[PDB]
Amino acid sequence: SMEMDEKDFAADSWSLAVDSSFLQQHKKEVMKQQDVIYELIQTELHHVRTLKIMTRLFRTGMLEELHLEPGVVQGLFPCVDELSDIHTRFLSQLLERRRQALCPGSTRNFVIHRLGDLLISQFSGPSAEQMCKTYSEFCSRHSKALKLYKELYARDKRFQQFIRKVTRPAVLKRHGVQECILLVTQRITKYPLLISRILQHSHGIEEERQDLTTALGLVKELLSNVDEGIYQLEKGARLQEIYNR
Amino acid sequence: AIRKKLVIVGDGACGKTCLLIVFSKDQFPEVYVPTVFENYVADIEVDGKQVELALWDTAGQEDYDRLRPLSYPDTDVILMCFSIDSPDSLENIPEKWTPEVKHFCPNVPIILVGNKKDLRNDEHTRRELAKMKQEPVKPEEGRDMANRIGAFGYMECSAKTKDGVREVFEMATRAALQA
């Protein structure tokens, strides 16, 4: 992540991020809504950071330092460029909604009142079809990526040295290769939980309550389609094992 | 330190997310309780052995039977949770959660954990449950379920007061280290 956004999302909550004199001006229900919207954006910033560790630190470092056989780096990091493009664009929209809502003279005090429309847009039309295609592919290649990683780590000295080198710093403690793969697979199923809690505190404006209800339904439709589209790929699986599913 | 993986499973109302949050912070949040848990790697020393214990939640995956099993590869210990204020969450343990974890995590120890133990003597909880002819889960009901499902053991905790939380994760670390 870039320092400007890390500092904007350093606090444990929106109520601790804004100035205390600005917090005091709002009703408790608004503070509760803003704290959950802040968690959605903060966790999206961290999810895009997970995808940058996968593309920049791991994938590109392996291409630039190691002599892996062709198709092996794509096997370890399936769909990572497409996932980065989807989430970096979505994060850009969330951060621009916050930036437009800042008070003049402040880089920290804002209230987002209209999140629902942004979520309906992300989870409908071509962007939703792209998210469905990409996660159905990624999640079907998840087991194969883990097995390929374990095989290379156990048998290739230069690969083991590379992994131990780039994952040594304390800031990578939660982000080894296998951990990044599962953080990405689990991201999509965090959205209903976050949207439902934002909706619980968004009844004050009926258009907002309706738009978040529509977004929640679209996200659950996407998840149902991805879940029905998954079949784990396995290296060396024979056609007979597949057609006898 | 050796690296081990823990996964928590259980129904949506079981308190799994709150349990992971309270353990990873050593605190019940005073200002904002997070909605979700990403992951965490805890440094734990149990009985003189140092372990890096990676922690994972399955919250949000309960309705998605093809996404949820992607959380299980190479798990070393399972925490299987139910809430003491919900006999319904305990009823779903033996024939829904247990056959799934035994299939995807063969031979992995399961610790059955009764969450929200502070609600066993909460008057509001006892009144709401009595309307459905129910009562908070009794300790013997939790131990008998753990015994029946072949759990490594039975433990109780309260994420709200932190009572019992350190003990659950130290025991999960010991279970993960066993042959």
Ligand SMILES: CCOc1c(F)cccc1C(=O)N(C)C
């Ligand atoms: C179709 C829209 O999907 C995208 C998006 F929402 C953001 C950034 C890029 C893309 C895209 O064109 N692909 C191929 C992933």
